[PDB]
Amino acid sequence: GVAAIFGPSHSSSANAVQSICNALGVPHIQTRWKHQVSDNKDSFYVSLYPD
Amino acid sequence: FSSLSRAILDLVQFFKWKTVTVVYDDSTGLIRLQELIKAPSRYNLRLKIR
């Protein structure tokens, strides 16, 4: 039982946790850059690293 | 694409080009052609990436 997951901070690992956090509803706060593909229909994530 | 980018680089030297205009569609396509983008560092090509 958590309220937010503050990122596993790597491009191969954050894509796996984002699709879990998109599924279950819990937000996923990212603090590093990640290659976000164009057809990734995800909404439950924010990224504090500058784009 | 470590081998396909070297095969496209052989056709821009068999045809003796000097100015290419590499066009991709999504941001992953730079990784698929990174052995072609690094070519003006050693050869006489002139890349214009769009």
- Cα–Cα distance for residue pair A3/B22, rounded to 1 Å: 46
B27–A35 C-beta distance less than 8 A: yes
Q: Which of A11, A38, A39, A40 to substitute to test the interface with B, most B CBs within 10 Å?
A: A38
Q: Tokens representing B18? A: 């000097």
**Which DSSP letter does residue A5 get?**
B
The technique by which this structure was obtained is: cryo-EM
> Reported resolution in A?
3.5
Find the closest chain B residue to A38 by CA distance. Answer: B26
- Cα–Cα distance for residue pair A39/A23, rounded to 1 Å: 16
Do residues A22 and A36 lie in contact, with contact meaning Cβ atoms separated by under 8 Å?
no
On whether any CB of chain A is under 8 Å from the CB of B26, the answer is yes
**3-state secondary structure labels for all residues of chain B:** CCCHHHHHHHHHHHCCCCCECCCCCCCCHHHHCHHHHCHHHCCCCCECCC
Q: Tokens representing B41? A: 């560092």
CB pairs under 8 A between A and B: 6
DSSP A7-46: ---SHHHHHHHHHHHHHH---BEE-S-----TT----S-E
Do residues A44 and A22 lie in contact, with contact meaning Cβ atoms separated by under 8 Å?
yes
- Cα–Cα distance for residue pair B16/B45, rounded to 1 Å: 9
- Cα–Cα distance for residue pair B50/B47, rounded to 1 Å: 10
Dihedral angle sign, alpha carbons of residues B8, B13, B17, B18: positive
Of A37, A51, A42, nearest to A24 by C-alpha is A42
